[PDB]
Amino acid sequence: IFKVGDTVVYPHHGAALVEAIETRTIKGEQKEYLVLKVAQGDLTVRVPAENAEYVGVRDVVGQEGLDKVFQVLRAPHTEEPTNWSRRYKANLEKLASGDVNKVAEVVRDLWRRDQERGLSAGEKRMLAKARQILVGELALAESTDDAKAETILDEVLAA
Amino acid sequence: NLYRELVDRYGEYFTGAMGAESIQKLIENFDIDAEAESLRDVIRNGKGQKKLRALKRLKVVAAFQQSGNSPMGMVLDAVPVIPPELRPMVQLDGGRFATSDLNDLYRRVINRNNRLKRLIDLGAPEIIVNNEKRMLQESVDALFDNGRRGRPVTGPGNRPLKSLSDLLKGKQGRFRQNLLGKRVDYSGRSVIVVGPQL
Amino acid sequence: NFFDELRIGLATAEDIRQWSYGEVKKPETINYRTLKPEKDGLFCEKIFGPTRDWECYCGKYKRVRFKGIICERCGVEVTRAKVRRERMGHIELAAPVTHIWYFKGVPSRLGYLLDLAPKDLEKIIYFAAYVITSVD
Amino acid sequence: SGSMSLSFSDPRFDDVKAPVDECKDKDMTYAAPLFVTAEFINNNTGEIKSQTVFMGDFPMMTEKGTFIINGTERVVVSQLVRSPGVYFDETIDKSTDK
Amino acid sequence: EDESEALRQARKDAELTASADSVRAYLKQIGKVALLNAEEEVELAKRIEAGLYATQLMTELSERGEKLPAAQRRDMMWICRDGDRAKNHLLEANLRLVVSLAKRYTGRGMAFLDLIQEGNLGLIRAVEKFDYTKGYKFSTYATWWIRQAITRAMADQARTIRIPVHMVEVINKLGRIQRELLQDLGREPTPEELAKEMDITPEKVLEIQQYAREPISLDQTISQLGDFIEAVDAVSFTLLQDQLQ
Amino acid sequence: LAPRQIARYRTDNGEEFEVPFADDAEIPGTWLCRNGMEGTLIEGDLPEPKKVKPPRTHWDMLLERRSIEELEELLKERLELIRSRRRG
Amino acid sequence: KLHHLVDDKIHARSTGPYSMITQQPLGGKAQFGGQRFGEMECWAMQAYG
Amino acid sequence: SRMERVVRERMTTQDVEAITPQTLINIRPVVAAIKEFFGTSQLSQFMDQ
DNA sequence: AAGTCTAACCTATAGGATACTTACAGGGACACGGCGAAT
RNA sequence: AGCGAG
DNA sequence: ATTCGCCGTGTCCCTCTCGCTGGCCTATAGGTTAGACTT
Ligand SMILES: [Zn+2]
């Protein structure tokens, strides 16, 4: 699944690091829990290797995904009605899904609508959080000075 | 359910009611003189614990009968509001307003009253209006006398809020604290020592 | 001082509205910022009286010469600040309510007068059973 | 449901934030941050979530046995209570002297 | 043991008790009533709208209208009564749900039963404006309206000091942000953090905090506080008027 | 004191009512008395109160979200159902 | 030397702060306050005539 | 115990796999108790010295 | 300086649609109610 | 909550 | 089964005075209100 020190994408948390796979003989079987660490508060997760793919253990997308999401965020004309509830729930679901393209589409939409008027309080926090995770995975895929990563993200997003 | 059967079959020619309004209607359609005469007759021909109960109830009713005070004043349609300065609202410390407890009780009565008025106006099933009337009843009870019925309405800290009655009972009430003994000006105190040359 | 008698007695609703100088409607005590009692609230000046001597809500009246006059826009009678200590309010109940003392105090004077019993009275008044006002 | 569980372990205490005299002067409450290992476990699939959670500023007994709250000095007085248990008490009833 | 009879006679005898707890009492007032079926609720709403249209048609034709037939009049009056009883039954079915969602704001501000009745009012408004043309669950639409009503009533009746609804909104917003900021950082957030968070000058947070303050009952103990709450000038003014004399 | 008089009204339940003002003022058309509801003069002016239409009513709520034709259809359906119930 | 020194005990009042619910004088050395002429004292005065 | 009550209430509202021990834990009960115990209690007596 | 004349701000009302159905001492005294003989 | 006089 | 006479049990108001110290989210119409020029 992964060796020691690999980089892993575990949504909705995003980037994480694996250190080992301790096989906890609990339940009479050595549960190959891949010990994993995150960056938010150094939380530790023990994911069974038997169902690692089920819980969402995966890798950062290659540059093909990067160019695909570049095209996705370049695309205008994403419409929306007057209300707020529809987009709020939609972006909640698509951010909880641990996807790269849809998070980019929703963050682009929210960026442009904020730049137009300025919406609310908590949606600014969600915009920030989405931008942070996108920058983190971009730096992870490119290893490109995450401050530089967010600067270039802003540059391409502004277009 | 039996009440519903009785009314929906023979609602006419007999009147039923619930709550304080029912009691007020009952008092209205009642002659004090008839009850007093009946009590006089029973004591004239009664005996035993029946006699004692007759004597007690005769006292209660004859209190109204002998005097000009009718009992209709027992059921309240309007409730009075003690003036504001007996019900303080003053800022203190860091300008933090610090009212008394009567404001909460009066506010609860007002809240129940406004909600009840609206509800009747809109038109709701008898269940909810009965519930609101019950709320108003227990709130007026707490206002007039907290702890006397139901549960002691407790403000923050689970402390029973002072009601208008509470300002009478016990030491802290008005009578024993600020009428039969009051602090006085032109006064002082100090420790004492023997003054034998005096 | 000319005192001779304290004839306490039951106060009918008519007397309650007779005392009242107004009628508090809403449960509003004091404004959030200007720290002024509301209108038709539990402290409203028009009901009880001016919180400041020789003033009114809108404040167009401040001199003492026109004492005993109630303003137009805000309708506050120009009197002493201490008159609030005496003037009394009242509230109109949508539905009648029973005085707690006579109902619950042992022996229940209401029950004895109406020949009813304490638990029975508790049931009828607090909306737990029905009672027949009359029948022909 | 029981499909998930939460647990705690390893209560650890950090060094005192400010020295006793300092807290007594500047109104600070002489205390130590309290940290505990919180573990959230999913039973339906099997997961662990280990964290070092901050559980407040636990006041700390000074060397002289007095707490310092808001600069002021306070003492927690030992209380006396009736031990939980079983109590057999005998009483003589005057109705029949038994 | 179901039809053990005795076992149900005990239940019936237990149903006829005094009971003084109002929250328990209302728990049993809705106790007698049951739940509802979505499609049944659709038909209920249909009957409600039909009876409503019937009564308004009566009111419109009441002026310079027509002498309606006895059968037609009877049937339309019956439809109107059926609609009223239908909405009563619908509300009776929904009391359980509104109680179940109103139990989540207890322990604060006002009485739980008070929350219940304000939620009941919100429920009446929800049925007042319920649209079943798409045919979705009534409860999901309702929750928004009941929560709206109870939040309104909480805001209007929370404190002895009346504050506008906008201020209730900014205050509970301030409290929520304060709580989560403490949860994340663990240090008391400075007022400037909130000032920049909402994009305001360094005063709004102070005013909002001062408004958020709860009054302290003069009744207290340690003895109530009311006792300990506070002739040169009066004598002086009389003397000065005389001095002018 | 200042030249002062008393303005006259009457509340709806008969009781003739009265509140003081100064002579130099407009004796207003309307006043909320001590009894607790609005009243007007028996003197002239008659400012034609002209009450506003109610805030809201259940019918208009159904109006902005429904029309006449489908409600007519529901009414007819109920009518024929009840007709079958009574006579068949 | 016990901590009951007179300088913390002595007190007089001639006109000081008054409460607001009732206009009686306050009570306590921290304020001016008076001295509670309670009920037993009133019985003594009645007894003297 | 109040902590446990509030977190057990929380687990129903929060969706699984979208929660972290930070989210589960709201200190407000515990500290309040401590703050409410040391100040305003019958045993956390003001030091008399 | 109040009397206009000008230009904002603030708030009671209202409105949005997955799903979710039963909270949280002691003492004396009197009045409301068990146990037994009589008609 | 603690304390002084009886 | 009701009457009357006994017991029996449950629920409630009272037990000194006086000091001192400290401690959700908008959308909109109408009400309301800030500032400024003036003869
Ligand atoms: Zn005025």
UniProtKB/Swiss-Prot annotation, chain C:
Residues the record lists as binding Zn(2+) 1: 56, 58, 71, 74
Highest taxon above the source species: Bacteria
Coiled coil: none
Family of this protein: Belongs to the RNA polymerase beta' chain family.
Subunit structure: The RNAP catalytic core consists of 2 alpha, 1 beta, 1 beta' and 1 omega subunit. When a sigma factor is associated with the core the holoenzyme is formed, which can initiate transcription.
Role played: DNA-dependent RNA polymerase catalyzes the transcription of DNA into RNA using the four ribonucleoside triphosphates as substrates.
Protein name per Swiss-Prot or TrEMBL: DNA-directed RNA polymerase subunit beta'
Organism for this UniProt entry: Mycobacterium bovis (strain ATCC BAA-935 / AF2122/97)
Gene: rpoC
Curated annotation (Swiss-Prot), chain E:
Family: Belongs to the sigma-70 factor family. RpoD/SigA subfamily.
Region feature Sigma-70 factor domain-3, mapped onto this chain: 169-234
Part of the intact protein present: 206 to 461 of 528
Region of interest (Sigma-70 factor domain-2), ranges: 90-160
Name of the protein in question: RNA polymerase sigma factor SigA
UniProt-annotated location(s): Cytoplasm
Quaternary structure note: Interacts transiently with the RNA polymerase catalytic core.
Function: Sigma factors are initiation factors that promote the attachment of RNA polymerase to specific initiation sites and are then released. This sigma factor is the primary sigma factor during exponential growth.
Disulfide bonds listed in the record: none
Intervals of motif Interaction with polymerase core subunit RpoC: 114-117
Organism the protein comes from: Mycobacterium bovis (strain ATCC BAA-935 / AF2122/97)
Swiss-Prot record, chain F:
Included stretch of the parent chain: 24 to 111 of 111
GO biological process, any: positive regulation of DNA-templated transcription
Name of the protein in question: RNA polymerase-binding protein RbpA
Subunit structure: Forms a complex with the RNAP catalytic core and with free principal sigma factors.
Stretches assigned to coiled coil: none
Signal peptide segment: none
The keyword S-adenosyl-L-methionine is assigned to this record: no
Role description: Binds to RNA polymerase (RNAP), stimulating transcription from principal, but not alternative sigma factor promoters.
Keywords: Transcription, Transcription regulation
Family: Belongs to the RNA polymerase-binding protein RbpA family.
GO terms for MF: bacterial-type RNA polymerase core enzyme binding
Curated annotation (Swiss-Prot), chain G:
Family: Belongs to the RNA polymerase beta chain family.
Subunit structure: The RNAP catalytic core consists of 2 alpha, 1 beta, 1 beta' and 1 omega subunit. When a sigma factor is associated with the core the holoenzyme is formed, which can initiate transcription.
Natural source organism: Mycobacterium tuberculosis (strain CDC 1551 / Oshkosh)
Chain's role: DNA-dependent RNA polymerase catalyzes the transcription of DNA into RNA using the four ribonucleoside triphosphates as substrates.
Protein name, UniProt field: DNA-directed RNA polymerase subunit beta
Gene name tied to this protein: rpoB
